[PDB]
């Protein structure tokens, strides 16, 4: 509503079509279908959902569907629910787990669920944006999946809008270049002969870590 009143959302609609989900799943499915059709019709379609909505639960994105995923802040659960408070108290009294730590873990799990569905393989590349200064916190940042946290370069930590746009342009241009599956051989893809190499087996063993 504030975007519409300010008029900024009008230019956003001018650039790409806008689709916003509602509480009714019947019309939400139609909106998602329209978004997918627009994305397959060459016209920009933008989806605005919640981390607890149906989109984050059972919707999967193809490479051309998960190009850009932006999380607006850490999705902390509404604390006014006494059920949540009682559960936090019980966990603290039975597992010595602080309520703030559990809330941060749940919010980071929801964020990773929302963003982790934008990649479908090596040939799939997508953009991840976290528009919040709170993610810069070490405790909050450390609660990210290892395969995602490892690629989280510190040079991208707490950027601005223009810097984020420039980095997105660079990443898109670099990753939109033509690529061959033969290049993946020996580095990220293994053939039948590469499996028999003992050095490859040692590298595979070093890849995984147990905790």
């Amino acid at each position: 509503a504030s975007w519409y009143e300010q008029g900024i959302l009008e230019n956003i609609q001018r650039n790409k079509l806008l689709f916003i989900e509602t509480q009714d799943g019947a019309e939400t499915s139609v909106a998602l279908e329209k978004y997918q059709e627009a994305c397959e019709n060459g016209r920009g379609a933008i989806l605005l959902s919640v981390a607890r909505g149906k989109v984050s639960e059972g919707i999967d994105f193809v490479h051309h569907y998960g190009r850009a995923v932006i999380m607006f802040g850490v999705p902390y659960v509404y604390t006014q629910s006494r059920i949540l408070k009682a559960r936090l108290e019980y966990l603290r009294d039975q597992f010595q787990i602080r309520e703030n730590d559990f809330l941060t873990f749940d919010a980071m799990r929801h964020a990773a669920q929302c963003v982790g569905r934008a990649i479908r393989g090596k040939t799939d590349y997508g953009l991840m944006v976290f528009a919040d200064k709170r993610f810069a916190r070490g405790d909050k940042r450390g609660k990210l999946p290892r395969w995602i946290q490892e690629h989280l370069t510190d040079a991208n930590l707490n950027l601005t809008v223009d810097e984020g746009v420039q980095v997105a342009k660079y990443f898109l241009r670099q990753m939109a270049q033509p690529f061959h599956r033969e290049d993946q051989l020996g580095l990220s893809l293994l053939s039948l002969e590469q499996l028999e190499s003992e050095e490859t087996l040692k590298r595979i063993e070093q890849i995984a870590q147990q905790l």
Binding site: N41, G42, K169, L172
Partner: protein, 355 residues
């Protein structure tokens, strides 16, 4: 709470040819250029429009240099409409003039890929099957408006055997990628001005001929430069047919080129005769693409220290001081970096092989 202390005292301290396969001997290339608001962006200095059109002029010059028997058409998509900026012809001067005029255009609206593709297909509908139909599209904006379903147009183009290649500017488009893959063309993304020039140079070379490509024995004529002397009684000045098409009064030339099939007079070659449809070409024009028939294979690179032989280049007699030495496969000569680059790029022939 950073006001507690701040000092910089410590800062003050002392310190790519394919196989021997059939290619595009006959080409009918159409260029699609975006004219949306995104062309005003300054990704390429000074803006996308000026650099893009300068590189387009360079591409046209190189394409006419390497493909004398090809055709160039220019289509500009602006305000969700398609405009045939330049007629499909082989004249480089007209194309350069049109591009220079379009340099000072206005970039507004959104691109209309569907309309431009439909217009190109309509123009290329009447073209013979043996001639290759090639489409180049410049896509600045990432969104386009189509009055109808584009997939039906994609199927129609696939049935029409038309090659479509798209060189995007911002990022990869899934729809454009699918269209290029189905049409047999290649999709590329611009990294910078140098990358754009490299992509244009790569696209200058004819694409390999597919299985569906036809093989017909086309008939062509090669008229001489008939020049009439006013001293002789057989001097008949006549206006050129091509010059008649312009609003300016054609120049009454004493001689020129006359069509052997219908005595049509033209002052420019290689230009296909408009009357009988005969393609009036010249012997150098045909031989201008012979280098594609026999590409120059890359020479073996052996460093100077590991090469115990002549210290002077075989091509320029220069002393071999480079860290790398290029040796031919056939005659096993010695070529420096400059000579090897020039031969592979321009000469396409080895002097020792000629000997």
């Amino acid at each position: 709470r950073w006001e507690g202390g701040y000092e910089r005292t410590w800062e003050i301290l002392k310190e790519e040819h394919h196989g021997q396969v059939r290619l595009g001997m006959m080409r009918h290339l159409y260029v699609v250029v975006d004219g949306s608001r995104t062309m005003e962006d300054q990704d390429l200095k000074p803006n996308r429009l000026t650099c893009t059109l300068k590189l387009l002029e360079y591409f046209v010059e190189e394409y006419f240099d390497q493909n004398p028997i090809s055709q160039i058409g220019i289509i500009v998509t602006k305000s969700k409409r398609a405009e045939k900026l330049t007629e499909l012809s082989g004249n480089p001067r007209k194309h350069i003039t049109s591009l220079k005029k379009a340099v000072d255009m206005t970039c507004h609206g959104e691109p209309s890929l569907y309309n431009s593709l439909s217009i190109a297909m309509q123009t290329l509908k009447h073209m013979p099957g043996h001639t290759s139909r090639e489409v180049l599209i410049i896509f600045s904006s990432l969104t386009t408006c189509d009055p109808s379903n584009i997939y039906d147009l994609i199927k129609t183009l696939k049935a029409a055997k038309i090659r479509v290649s798209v060189i995007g500017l911002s990022a990869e488009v899934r729809v454009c990628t699918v269209l290029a893959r189905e049409t047999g063309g290649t999709y590329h993304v611009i990294l910078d001005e140098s990358h754009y020039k490299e992509l244009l140079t790569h696209h200058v070379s004819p694409p390999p001929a597919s299985s569906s490509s036809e093989c017909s024995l086309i008939r062509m004529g090669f008229p001489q430069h008939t020049i009439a002397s006013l001293s002789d009684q057989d001097a008949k000045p006549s206006f050129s047919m091509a010059h008649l098409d312009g609003n300016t009064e054609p120049g009454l030339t004493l001689g020129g080129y006359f069509c052997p099939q219908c005595r049509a007079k033209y002052c420019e070659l290689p230009v296909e005769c408009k009357i009988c449809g005969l393609t009036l070409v010249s012997a150098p024009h045909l031989a201008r693409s012979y280098h594609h028939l026999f590409p120059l294979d890359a020479f073996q690179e052996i460093p100077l220290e590991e090469y115990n032989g002549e210290r002077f280049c075989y091509g320029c007699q220069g002393e071999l001081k480079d860290q790398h030495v290029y040796v031919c496969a056939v005659c096993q000569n010695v070529f420096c970096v400059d000579c090897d680059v020039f031969v592979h790029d321009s000469l396409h022939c080895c002097p020792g092989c000629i000997h």
